[PDB]
Every structure is written in C-alpha cells, then in structure tokens.
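pipeline: protein-struct stage 2 | run 1193 | Eukaryotic translation initiation factor 4E
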Amino acid sequence: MATVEPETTPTPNPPTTEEEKTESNQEVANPEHYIKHPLQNRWALWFFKNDKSKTWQANLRLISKFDTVEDFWALYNHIQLSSNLMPGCDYSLFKDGIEPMWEDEKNKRGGRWLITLNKQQRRSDLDRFWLETLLCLIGESFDDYSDDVCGAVVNVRAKGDKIAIWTTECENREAVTHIGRVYKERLGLPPKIVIGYQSHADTATKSGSTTKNRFVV
C-alpha cells in the first residue's frame, strides 16, 4: 500500500539560528530586555577581498561599525558563521577615528602581530581564540593597555584563517610584547602556532632580522 500525491513535507531542522538568519526569537526571556555594554571607544569593521583580477585597494568594502558590545554582537551573529569567510577575504577592526592615510597614518607606522589559525580547530580554537580577542581588545588580557591597539586585520587564506592586531605606537613595547607575548603565549602559539611579528620600522631596514620586529613562533 502507498499513496503518491504532489506534496512535500517540511524538512525538520535543528534549532540554533547560526546559519545566516535575520532575527528569530530572544524576547520575553528575562528582565534584561535591552542590555547594552558601553565601550570606552568605537571600533569599525572593514572587509577587503582580493580577487584574481582586481586589487584589494579597489575591492575595499565596509561591513559595519560599533561603539557598544551589543552592536558588534548583533553583527557577530551575522558575520561569524562563514558568511564572508571565503578565500581571499580579509577584514579589519580599528577605531572609527581612522582615516585613509591622512591623520591616522600612525596606524601604519605602528606595529602588529600575525597569527595563523586553522579551520580544522576553528570549532574550539577559532571560537575561543576569537571570542577572547574581541573581549580582550576592549577589556581582557590586553587590559586598558589595549587602548593603544589601533585595530586588527583577519585574512583567511581559503581554509586557513589568520588574525592580526596592530598597535598605534610601535614604541609601546609594553603593549607590543605584553599583549603580543601574552596573547601568543596564552594562546599556545610558541609550541605550535607561528606568530609572525611585523613592524612598520622594517620598511626602513628590511633584509634579515635585526631588532624585535620580524619574528615568527
């Protein structure tokens, strides 16, 4: 026995709301019907991807900016989920005060550390290492010293995710090493992940290693 009729039954799906969805249901849950965390500063997020035909400078696109955790949070659930983590994709997170190499040129003259993330452990590593950075940038690990950190760029080579953070004043070795050595050390890169450190000063020297600027481990 069997009756064939033109009709398809809804395909059951697991509840999560983490597969590119605009709102779902998070109201009437607790007295906190509008809890927003006030950040000391405002950080905007830029997304630039280089295609095999055009330059990144021309493919520079902006995603959004936020001066409150509740803000970046709303974006996190819309950006964090393979929404735009395709090959050749990149995104930066710095102070909105930044400028196209005009007055905030100091961001380019500063310094930054580069980390190599692998999608293989993205589940725990990318989720933990990233979540920590966000809260660490604003208030954690780097502490108030983070105020110097101009921003961080994330470049994911196809499947390999990469994260980089740049300091406003490369001279602030206190943040450079303390936040860079603690982040890489606390993250557990030295004994596995190679975190290359690049300083703008290298432009006026380059060629082989000289001082604390151009080390990966």
